[PDB]
Every structure is written in C-alpha cells, then in structure tokens.
Amino acid sequence: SIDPEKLRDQLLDAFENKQNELKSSKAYYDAERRPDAIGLAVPLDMRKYLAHVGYPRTYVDAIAERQELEGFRIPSANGEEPESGGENDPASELWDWWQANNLDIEATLGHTDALIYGTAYITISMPDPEVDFDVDPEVPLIRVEPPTALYAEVDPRTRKVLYAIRAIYGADGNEIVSATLYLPDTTMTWLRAEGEWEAPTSTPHGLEMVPVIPISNRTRLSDLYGTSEISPELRSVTDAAAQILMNMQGTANLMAIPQRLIFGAKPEELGINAETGQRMFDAYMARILAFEGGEGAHAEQFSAAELRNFVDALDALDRKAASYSGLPPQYLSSSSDNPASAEAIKAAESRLVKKVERKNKIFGGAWEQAMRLAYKMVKGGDIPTEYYRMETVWRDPSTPTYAAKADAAAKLFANGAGLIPRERGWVDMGYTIVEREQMRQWLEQDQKQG
Amino acid sequence: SIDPEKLRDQLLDAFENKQNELKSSKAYYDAERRPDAIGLAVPLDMRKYLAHVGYPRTYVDAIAERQELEGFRIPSANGEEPESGGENDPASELWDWWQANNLDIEATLGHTDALIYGTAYITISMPDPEVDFDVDPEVPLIRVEPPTALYAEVDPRTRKVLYAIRAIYGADGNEIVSATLYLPDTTMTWLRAEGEWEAPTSTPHGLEMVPVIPISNRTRLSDLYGTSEISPELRSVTDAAAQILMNMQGTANLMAIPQRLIFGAKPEELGINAETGQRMFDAYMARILAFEGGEGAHAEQFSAAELRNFVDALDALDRKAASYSGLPPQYLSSSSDNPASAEAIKAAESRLVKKVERKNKIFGGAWEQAMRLAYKMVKGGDIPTEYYRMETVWRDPSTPTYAAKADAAAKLFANGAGLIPRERGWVDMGYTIVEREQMRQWLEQDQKQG
Amino acid sequence: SADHSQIAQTKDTMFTGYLDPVQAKDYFAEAEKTSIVQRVAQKIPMGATGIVIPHWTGDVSAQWIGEGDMKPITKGNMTKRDVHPAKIATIFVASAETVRANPANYLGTMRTKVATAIAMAFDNAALHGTNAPSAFQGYLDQSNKTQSISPNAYQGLGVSGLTKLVTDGKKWTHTLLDDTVEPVLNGSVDANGRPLFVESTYESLTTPFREGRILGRPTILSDHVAEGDVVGYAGDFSQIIWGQVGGLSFDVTDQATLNLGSQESPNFVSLWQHNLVAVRVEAEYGLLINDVNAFVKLTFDPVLTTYALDLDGASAGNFTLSLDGKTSANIAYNASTATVKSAIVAIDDGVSADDVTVTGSAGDYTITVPGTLTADFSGLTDGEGASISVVSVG
Amino acid sequence: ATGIVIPHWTGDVSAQWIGEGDMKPITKGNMTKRDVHPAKIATIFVASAE
Amino acid sequence: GFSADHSQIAQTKDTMFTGYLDPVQAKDYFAEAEKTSIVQRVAQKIPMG
Amino acid sequence: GLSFDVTDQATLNLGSQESPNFVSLWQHNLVAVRVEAEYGLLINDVNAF
Numbered sequence A, B: 001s002i003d004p005e006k007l008r009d010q011l012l013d014a015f016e017n018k019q020n021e022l023k024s025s026k027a028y029y030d031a032e033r034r035p036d037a038i039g040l041a042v043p044l045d046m047r048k049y050l051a052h053v054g055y056p057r058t059y060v061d062a063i064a065e066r067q068e069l070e071g072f073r074i075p076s077a078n079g080e081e082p083e084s085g086g087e088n089d090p091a092s093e094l095w096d097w098w099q100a101n102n103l104d105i106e107a108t109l110g111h112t113d114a115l116i117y118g119t120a121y122i123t124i125s126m127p128d129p130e131v132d133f134d135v136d137p138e139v140p141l142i143r144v145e146p147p148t149a150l151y152a153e154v155d156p157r158t159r160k161v162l163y164a165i166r167a168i169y170g171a172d173g174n175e176i177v178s179a180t181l182y183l184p185d186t187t188m189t190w191l192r193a194e195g196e197w198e199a200p201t202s203t204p205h206g207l208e209m210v211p212v213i214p215i216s217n218r219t220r221l222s223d224l225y226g227t228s229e230i231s232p233e234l235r236s237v238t239d240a241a242a243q244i245l246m247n248m249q250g251t252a253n254l255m256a257i258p259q260r261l262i263f264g265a266k267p268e269e270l271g272i273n274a275e276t277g278q279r280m281f282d283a284y285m286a287r288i289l290a291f292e293g294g295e296g297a298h299a300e301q302f303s304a305a306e307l308r309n310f311v312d313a314l315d316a317l318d319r320k321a322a323s324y325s326g327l328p329p330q331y332l333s334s335s336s337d338n339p340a341s342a343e344a345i346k347a348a349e350s351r352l353v354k355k356v357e358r359k360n361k362i363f364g365g366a367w368e369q370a371m372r373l374a375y376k377m378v379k380g381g382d383i384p385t386e387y388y389r390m391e392t393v394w395r396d397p398s399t400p401t402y403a404a405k406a407d408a409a410a411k412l413f414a415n416g417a418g419l420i421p422r423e424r425g426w427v428d429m430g431y432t433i434v435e436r437e438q439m440r441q442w443l444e445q446d447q448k449q450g
Numbered sequence C: 001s002a003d004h005s006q007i008a009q010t011k012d013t014m015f016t017g018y019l020d021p022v023q024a025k026d027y028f029a030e031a032e033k034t035s036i037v038q039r040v041a042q043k044i045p046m047g048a049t050g051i052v053i054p055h056w057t058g059d060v061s062a063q064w065i066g067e068g069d070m071k072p073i074t075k076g077n078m079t080k081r082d083v084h085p086a087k088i089a090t091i092f093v094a095s096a097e098t099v100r101a102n103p104a105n106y107l108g109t110m111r112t113k114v115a116t117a118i119a120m121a122f123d124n125a126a127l128h129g130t131n132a133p134s135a136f137q138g139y140l141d142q143s144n145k146t147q148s149i150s151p152n153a154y155q156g157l158g159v160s161g162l163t164k165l166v167t168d169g170k171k172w173t174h175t176l177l178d179d180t181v182e183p184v185l186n187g188s189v190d191a192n193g194r195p196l197f198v199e200s201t202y203e204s205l206t207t208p209f210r211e212g213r214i215l216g217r218p219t220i221l222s223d224h225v226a227e228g229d230v231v232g233y234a235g236d237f238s239q240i241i242w243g244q245v246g247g248l249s250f251d252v253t254d255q256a257t258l259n260l261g262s263q264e265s266p267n268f269v270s271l272w273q274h275n276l277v278a279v280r281v282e283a284e285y286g287l288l289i290n291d292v293n294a295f296v297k298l299t300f301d302p303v304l305t306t307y308a309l310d311l312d313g314a315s316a317g318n319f320t321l322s323l324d325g326k327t328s329a330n331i332a333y334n335a336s337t338a339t340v341k342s343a344i345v346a347i348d349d350g351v352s353a354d355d356v357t358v359t360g361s362a363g364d365y366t367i368t369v370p371g372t373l374t375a376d377f378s379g380l381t382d383g384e385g386a387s388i389s390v391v392s393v394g
Numbered sequence D: 001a002t003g004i005v006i007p008h009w010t011g012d013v014s015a016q017w018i019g020e021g022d023m024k025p026i027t028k029g030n031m032t033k034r035d036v037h038p039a040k041i042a043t044i045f046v047a048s049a050e
Numbered sequence E: 001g002f003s004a005d006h007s008q009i010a011q012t013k014d015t016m017f018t019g020y021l022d023p024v025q026a027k028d029y030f031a032e033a034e035k036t037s038i039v040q041r042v043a044q045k046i047p048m049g
Numbered sequence F: 001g002l003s004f005d006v007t008d009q010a011t012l013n014l015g016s017q018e019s020p021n022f023v024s025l026w027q028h029n030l031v032a033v034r035v036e037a038e039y040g041l042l043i044n045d046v047n048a049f
Helices: A004-030 A055-064 A090-100 A103-116 A232-254 A308-325 A342-378 A385-389 A403-416 A422-429 A435-446 B004-029 B055-064 B090-100 B103-116 B232-254 B308-325 B342-348 B350-378 B385-389 B402-416 B422-428 B433-449 C096-101 C103-127 C153-166 C179-185 C337-345
Strands: A069-073 A119-125 A141-145 A150-154 A161-169 A176-182 A186-190 A200-204 A212-216 A260-263 A288-291 A298-301 A391-394 B069-073 B119-125 B141-145 B150-155 B160-169 B176-183 B186-190 B201-204 B212-216 B259-263 B298-302 B391-394 C051-056 C078-083 C086-095 C146-148 C174-178 C217-222 C230-235 C240-253 C257-259 C268-270 C276-289 C295-299 C305-310 C318-323 C357-359 C366-369 C373-376 C387-390 D004-009 D016-018 D031-036 F003-007 F032-036
Touching: A004 A055, A004 A103, A004 A150, A004 A161, A004 A176, A004 A186, A055 A103, A055 A232, A055 A308, A055 A342, A055 B308, A069 A090, A069 A103, A069 A342, A090 A103, A090 A342, A090 B385, A103 A119, A103 A141, A103 A212, A103 A342, A103 B350, A119 A150, A119 A342, A150 A212, A161 A212, A212 A342, A232 A308, A232 B232, A232 B308, A298 B259, A298 B298, A308 B308, A342 A385, A342 A391, A342 B342, A403 A422, A403 B402, A422 A435, A435 B422, B004 B055, B004 B103, B004 B150, B004 B160, B004 B176, B004 C240, B055 B103, B055 B232, B055 B308, B055 B350, B069 B090, B069 B103, B069 B350, B069 B433, B090 B103, B090 B350, B090 B433, B103 B119, B103 B141, B103 B212, B103 B350, B119 B150, B119 B160, B119 B350, B150 B212, B160 B212, B212 B350, B232 B308, B342 B350, B350 B385, B350 B391, B402 B422, B422 B433, C078 C276, C086 C096, C086 C103, C096 C103, C096 C276, C103 C240, C103 C276, C103 D004, C146 C153, C153 C179, C153 C230, C153 C295, C174 C179, C179 C230, C305 C373, C318 C337, C337 C357, C337 C366, C373 C387
Parallel strands: A288 B259, C146 C295, C174 C217
Antiparallel strands: A069 A391, A119 A141, A119 A212, A150 A161, A161 A176, A176 A186, A186 A200, A260 A298, B069 B391, B119 B141, B119 B212, B150 B160, B160 B176, B176 B186, B186 B201, B259 B298, C051 C078, C086 C276, C086 D016, C174 C230, C230 C295, C240 C276, C257 C268, C305 C366, C305 C387, C318 C373, C357 C366, D004 D031, F003 F032
C-alpha cells in the first residue's frame, strides 16, 4: 500500500527538482540572458548591451505553427463507411468533445510546450457544478497542463503513469496556492497548499489508470521521457552567433572609424590647455590645419576595423542554422531568391514537411490514447474494442497551393467518368473531415436543381 | 463578504503599479527614446540627434492589419436540423450585435494592443437609457478596453477573472477622473474624480461571473498571462540598428570628408591673423597655392572614413530583423528579391500568413467566450448547449490571387457537372458569410429570369 | 554603485552565477513560519479611523417590599473604549539589472520573506509585547498569573493552573503550546510509569500534539510561542480581538529618492540617478485584549515573578498588598523600602525573606515574589492614578 | 561527476512599527551556497583463462 | 515624525480635521450573557395564589 | 492651462536654502501636489489710463 500525505510530500520534491532541467531550455526560447552568448571582445562597461538571437523561437514555432487536428477515424465493427452515420457515428462523439473543450486552441499551445520542454500533460476529469465550470456538464472536462505545473511518475517497464502531482503557484514568491494528486484509484486536492494546512477534497474515478497522459517529444526509441526539440546543435549555433553580433556591436562603436594621430607635437604650441587636456578645433569641411611642425613631426592613422570580416562570418552561421534545423533557407534569409513554382515550393518545404508529419504521428499517439480515457470515464462501462484501432487525422503540413491541385483533381474526376470517386477528389483537394460533411449536404441540395 | 471601497483602493494600486511593465513595451511601438538605442561614438554635444528604427511598429502592424472576422459558426443541433443561413438563426443573432457595436472597427484596435502590451479586455453591459447615445437600446453594449485603462485579477488555478477595475485618467494623466469595479454578481462606478469621489452608481447583472473577458497573446500554456509580440530578439535588433544608424550619421558630419594638413609652415609667414588664428583665401577652381618651404614643409592628409563600413553592417541587421520577425524579406531589404509568380507570393508570405492564422485561433477563443457571455446577459436564462461549440470564422491572411483562384474554381465546378457543389465553390473563392447570403438571393433572381 | 553595500542589492558575493549544478531546491530549506494570533483571536472588521467598543456597567437593581410600601428608583450606566490601528512597514532596494535577472528568484523570495517578517512582528507584539506599538492595548505576557507544568502536565494544566484561573471568575477555553513542550507531555507518567495522553502500545503521537483536546479544551501548537521561561498559555481566547485595515501593499519605483542614513544624518540617493529599484511594503494592524489577567502563563518548575508598583506621585494615606487573596496591613505611601518586604512576609503564607525581594523607594517599588501579587489603593487619599504592573524579560 | 551546489537562505529581513509620516526603515536579504563532490570506490579480481 | 499641528504638512492628527475621522461604533464583542436563575430550574414549581 | 502634478516620488526641503531640512516624500508618506501656471502681460501705454 502507500500513504497519500507522504505522496503529497514526495511528489512536490520531485516536481521542484525537475524545474532546473527545464530552466535552461526556456532561456533559449524566451531569448533570456545566457553567459555563453556574451561577446568576449566587448569591454566590461559595454557588456551590458546584449545581442539576443532568434533561431530557437523560429525553429520551434515553424513546427508548432503548422499542425492542426482534423479529427479521428474509429473503424466500424461492420460495413465501414465514415460518410454514412454523421452525428450517430463514434468519430463525431470524439470530435464534439474536441470542439467543446476548445482543444483546437489549447492543443496548439500545449504542443509548443511539449516541444520546448520535451513533454506536456493531457488531463481528464468530470466537471463540478459546485465550481464555476462554465461548460456543457455532460462533456468530459479535458485540459492540457505544461510541465512547469505538473509532474508524473512513469513506470519504465510499461510507460504507464504511476501517479502525478499538479501544482499551482500563486501570484508571488513561488508560494504553492494549491496542489492536486492523481492516483490510479482517486483524485485529491488541497485548497491552500503553502504547507497544506487545508484538508483534502477528494473524488474517486472508475478508471484503473491515472487520468493524466504525457504528450512527449520522442527523438528516439531509447528517449523514454521525451526531450527538448531545441537540439544541442541549434543551441550551440545560437550562442556562437550571439558572440559574433555582440563583438560586431562593440566594433561599430569602438573601431569602425579610423583613429587620427599626430607625432612630434609640442602641446604648448598646439594650444592644448593643460587643465582641460583639449584644444578646440573647428570641424567645418574646407579648412586646412597649418601646424608649426618641424623636428620630424608627421600625421598618421590607425585603420578602421572592416565590419565585412564579421558579416562574412555571420553568413556562414545563417547557413548552419538552416542545415541543423531543416527550415527552408529563406525562413532564415540564408538566401533571398524565392522558389518560383508549385514544384520549387515543395522542394524548399521538403525537410520541414517530413519533420511535421513525424511529430503529428507521435503526438497523435497521445490523443488516440487520451480519448479512450475520456470515453471510458464519461460513458462508463468498458472500451468498445474498435476504439483501440482509431487513427488521429491531421491537416497536411504543406503550404496550401490551390490552383495546382485544382487542375489535377479536375482531370482525375473527368465530370464523373474519371479515375477516382467524388469523395476521394475532395480529400485530395484538402477539404477537412468536417467540411466534407458540409459539402455532402450541399451536394444533395444542388442535385434537386440540376 | 468583502468591502468594495477596500477593493477599489487596492485594485487602483495594482492597476497603477502594472504601468511600469507596459511603459517598456510602449517605448518600442511608439519609437520613443531609449538609452540602449544611443550610438556611443558620437560626441556628447551630438547625442541630441536621435535616429529611431521602425521594425517593432512594422512587425506589429504586419499582423494586426490582416486579422478580420467574417462571422460565427454554431452547430444547429444538426443531428435534428442542419438547415441554417437566414433569418432568426444564432449565427445572425450574434453577428447582428457585432455590427451594431462596430466591433469590426474596434476589434482591429483591440488586437493591436493585445499584440503590443500582451493583453486587452472585452467588456460587456446593457446600455444605460439614462445617457443619450449613438446605440441600439436592445443590443448588449460590448466594448474593448486597453491594459492602460483596465486591470483584472485572474485565478491561476482556473484561468478565470475574480474581479476587475476600469479606471480613466483626466486630460492630464495626473489624476483619475472615474473608476468602475466589476464583481462576479454586481458592477459599481464612482463617477467624480479621485480627489472628490461621490457615492457610486451600481447594478446587479444576474451572471455567475465577471463581465470582463481577457484577450491575451500567448505562445505556451506556461504563459499564464499574455506577453508582447515585440520580443527581446526584435528589441535587440531594433536597438542594435539604432546605434549603427546614429554612428553612421555622426560620421557623415565629422569624418566622411578628408582632413587637410600642412607641416612645418610658420604661421607668421603664411600671414595667419594672431587675433583669430586663421587666414581666409579665395578657394575657386584651379588656383594653385604656393608656399615658402621653411623647415622642409609639406602637405599631408587624413583619409575620409568609408561610410560603407557601417552600411554593409546595416544590411546584416536588416536580414536579422527579417529572420526574427518572419516578415517576407522584401518588407525589410529592398531588391533582396521581388516575386514574379503566384507561387512565389505563397513562398514569401508563408511565415507571416501562418503566424496570423495562429493568432486568429488565440483571439477567436476570447471572442467566442465574450459573445456567449453577452447572450447570457441580454437573453437571460442560460446557454443553449450548442453555443459551447461556437467557432469564430476569419478571412484568409493571404494576399488574394483572385485571377488564379477564379481559373481554378471554374475548373472544379465545370458548369455544374464537376467535382464540388456550388456553395464550396463560393467558399474557395473566399466570399464572406454575408456576401454569400447576398449571392444566394441574386442566384435565385437569375434562375427566376432564365 | 558600491558592490556589497548594506542597503542595495547588486551583482555581488551573494550569487554563484546560475550554472547547471545549482540544485533546484535548497534541500535543507525549513518551511516558512506563520502567525498564531491571527488563527486564535476574533478577527473584527476594521477601518482607518479605528472603532469604538461599548460596554454596560450599571448596578440595575430591585428590592423586596411590603404591602403598599412605596417603590425604589434604580440606574443603568454605560461606557466605551476606542481601538486604533498602527502601521508596520519596510523597504527593500535592488539594482535594475538585479530586478531584470531576478537571480534565484530573489525578488519573489523577498516579497514572501517581508510578509513573514510582518506576520511574526504581529505575533511577538501581541504575545510577548516586544517592540509593540503605542496603539495596541495589552499583551499576553503582561498577565499577573503563572503556573509551572514540567513534572506532570496533567496536574499542571488541568488542576493547579485551572485553580488559579477559575478563582478570579475567569475561565479556560483553549491552550496554546510551543513545540518544545513535547518532551514534558511525553512521560508525565502515572505512579506505575505509564505515560498519560497516549495509547497502550505508544505508537501513536501524543494526544494534544495531534491538535487534540485536553479536558474538552482544544490545543493549539506553535514552533515559536516560547520566549524566556514561558512555553505556552491557557485562558479565555475570546477576550482577544484584532483587525487589519488593508492587506500587505507592495509599491514599486525607479523614480523616487531614498535616504540611506538616519533622519538627522541623511544620505540621499536618487533611485533614478544610480538606476536602483525600490519596493515599499506596509500593512495596518489593530489589537485589543479585554484584560490580560484572563490567561495563565505556562513554564517549567521554579518560576518567580516581578511586579512594578506606581502610585502616580500620590501624597497621603496608605496602600495594601495581597498574595493568593491573603491581605496584609495598611502601608504608608512613603514607607521605607524594607517595610514593603516586611509587609509581604507578614502574610499568613510560606513566603519568606530569602525568597521575597524589593528595590526602589517611596511610591516606585519593584517587588519580586513566588506568586500572584495584587494591590489595593482604597486607603490612599489622592491615589487617583495609582497602579501595579508586571515586568518583562530582558 | 562535476558535483553539485546547494544554496541556503541566511537573511534576517525585518520591519518596524511607524507613526503617521515617520521615516520607513530599509532592509536587505542574505544567502549562502555549499558545494558537494563525489568519490570512487573500486576493486579488481583476476583469474586464469582455464 | 512631525509636530501635531505642523505648519507645512497636513496630517490626520491635525486639529483642523477634529470631528471628521470619528471612530466607528461596533458590537460589544465582550458582552457576557444574562445569567439565568438556577433555583427556578432545580425546584418544583407549585401553583400559588 | 493651470497645471496640477500629483507625486510622492520627489524630495522636498522643509526649510530655507541655508537650513533646508530635506525630506523624501516616498520614504516618509507625504503626497505632494505641485501647482504651476505661466502668464505674460503688456500695457502698450501706461499713460492711457
């Protein structure tokens, strides 16, 4: 057995312990001050003028900004046809809870934390009308929680969650205003948690499993707890580039102007006053300085530093930021000349597109799981066997080109005499799993006219 | 219970304190003076010649110009009645209030402030009959209020407002002229100025919750409160470029011209006036100057400073400004490229379009919440549960390729024999809800005529 | 800026630089302290003006009478006392770069530490009276009664202590103990050497330390109620009322000017000139104890009590002194100092010249005795301000 | 293998009661840090190939 | 601090504001109950004329 | 127009230039209101009255 007060202690230690592992990866995405970014040539008084670099934000956004769930594809036990039953079909039951929880907004935020911190947690519950849950009360209340507010213990034998704590800091002091413990058997919440002098509220649940699921950015099969998408190579080039910018920023102040010198001067004859150390020249353009000179007196310059020397080194790091991230090179401006054609679009987008299709497969594995728990909770009983085989379905990550696909799909369908049936032509043009239902109604209405 | 006079005296201190966050962001979008923007190399007497940089205003406007709402979609209880698009339907019932408040004007402003400061507040009431107005007295009077005039305390446990204050300064920012406190079950306003408050006007409103909804700009679930788009990389490149511009400018006043010296000439032989330290002479073309060569005297000169040694560093920071903001490079670096083709536009615009399309989700999640609350206020009673599935519908952020779209949509429809019903043909051409409702009547007149 | 200046926070010896090996917890952080008084006294709604508590004081009365024997007249009478708030406040100051970096969350850490320091100041100002403001009326340690508990807590609290509390017409409602009391509740055995307060196999925690009851009264536990010889209290905690006019304000500036010196030797620093940032913190509290003799102070065994006697300069007649309700003769307002010691040991009780002590002169005596001491001014012609009080630790 | 460092709080942060319009006091926090390094335990055993 | 009627700074303690800022009346939080008879409880109540 | 600044940030003297007795508004709890206006006047011919 186990002690719930002792878990309330033990989990808050593990949750606090975790925060410094996240803290570094946050600093790259926020572009906060980091010691390694500082340009070593810059004088200590100028070293205040930092030079932040945007590659990590650019890379993580250019993935998370390009995935959206369309829906789910639970197969029927007999006579399989997702076009047939509409609001009666189980694929629509799942989609209603996706709309009603606003998951089409909160998932596109949670996926960003799952990439930055390597994991984020889906949480399942039933709403309580003694609390201000302004939602449909017959819908399971599904939330996503960032790892800056939740920790879950994972069994390394099975990848099952053993137990988890969600913790809420107040406005201030990192005071833990509230903590919630999820167990295989029950959920518990302590309502003023800064030393937990409140008594536990509690709620049992029917599930044999903890009602929390980790989304996690797996890079490898060995990668069992997930990892930050901001890879060591992308960090290394981000910090390396920051030093070049900061050294150039000093150079543009200290060295870009050639320093002028005169040797063999007698300061008394130049009229350089001793107590101020300065003679007041006039800088108007046409004038000639006549110097009394003699005794080998002559004038000479230190050169400027040539800023080209730094700029031609930044351009190599603009290229390696592309190489290590797989972005289209024009997203980093590593070259400016556009891809001119619907084909050259696909060539440039190729690496990014296959990287997003890869994330969609893995993040699909979290929602394909969590919807089983949501169903098994709200409908009770046991999972209908087909649900174990459901696919998530995601929008095509490719940049949408319409006029190229239009002439393709038209020539395929050939006014109904063609190679594919109508509903496939609608998938290939890219209309969504719900929009194809809006059309399948309008099509029947147009067929009453001609 | 809790005292409202305590709360307005407390929440005014929180609202006034908060301004010390916002003043830092305002300084970038307004292009006001920063110390970090000052180029060090210009002499102290020249430091008055500031030179500001437009990147923050250009990035924020390039998003805020493109966000436009077409309308709302609500599922009609379509498991019994899909028929929709006409009089008395809920999508029109909400779109009526949207136009009657001119939120199609003020939301563009509200979205701008949500990007500049990181948050803005939608505020809801019935109109006062006591005050003469330009308003329809049956419509819920919905307004957007900026974070320089409203502050709302949010529960980090539930993401929900506890209470809020809307407080207005005089023509001088030096005193408050009125403040309104919103509580979950009532509203009150102290109408006279801060030095002379009188007894408040007040009303209940029957709602469960405070009639203030925060629009907030977010990148993560870990952003428990919204954050500016003028991110510290874009601040750094803005301030870095300001120094390069200012050092270039000072160089063009002092160093862009050669400096001319003569060594060894005796001032009394040159005829220098001892009272004034100089001799003037007629400087016209080809007049050969001649000197007696005492001390072996001769000329020499300091070179100019080459201004290109700064300009080919400004042409690096323009590429960083493009790269970190995700604008088309053509908005920054003139003749870095110019697109010849429809797909070349879809390349260049890709990052900007996809970022706007994501902000449309996050702000849509405020407006769908505000309209549902305004319905509960004006209709009374309770929400018909389909309204929890309400979707905002937004314009496509792309520049309209109308010739390419028209040639494609025709090849799809094929004079009615083709792959799609007429109505999706109209949606693919991008006609708004109201403009499609016009066409649905004009189509009937044309079919009547034959 | 001067690095490691005593007022200003700035990047100095206090920070390691935030290298990966820095542990996410101080694994030996003790949990933060909290007010006791704010969880045992009545919280009363209160405003900046302060409040007035009214009270009844009439000898309303009626008399037996015969047939036709004409009836007597009587009176009600009424009185009031006012109560006022006092501010507690502080400022902390940091370099703008320190506010920017917020190293180790120092700014958040400070904002909790000041709130705790303020909560602890309110406890000690009410319990022990240490550095208490002028506006607070009474503090618990000012009580005229003490009981020692250390050989057997049951005989201590439930019997001996209760006797000296109920005899004044006061009553026992709660008891409040320091965590250092644990090893005198543990043990406290019966004659056969079994403990009281715990069950027959001694696995359970001790009943009062569960926040359980003693003879029907609840037990309140604290890690910080002890000071000097005192380890706890028992009494009528309904006799305490307290108020708070507003929560802890926090107010923040780079723009203001401070003084780093004292008032008469000032060193003005413009926060803007040095680019420092300052945070103001303040709260208003009020407190009243209806009378301080409603509580018996709890100690270990051999405790001895000091009292200060103050006739307010009165100039003819006599006072008299009492221990445990036994009463001495009249004593002259100017009696020579050894007379007071002689008049105390002349009580019909086991007090003697080796235990009892006195110091001072005419009308300013300090008295030390092994018990409850009280004074009567009824024999004094002009004793119109005459008084007695209990002396602190030092 | 680089070891760890553990911070600890040490500041005596405090506040004073004040009258109306009195000079507020000023106060500062304090901390310390401690370092920990690991060490190795080892042994060898040897056998004939048979 | 400052003098009670300081010439430069206005304060709540200043004579000028007397009769404003009057402390608010409150319930007697220390009121003890009206003590009821014990004799009328223990003794048997006969009818009497 | 007649201008009012409200502040508690500044320092004030509370005596003359040679005995200034400076006080912080912010470290004490003084709020100060500063009042300023600017006027100019010309009479073209003071003998015309």
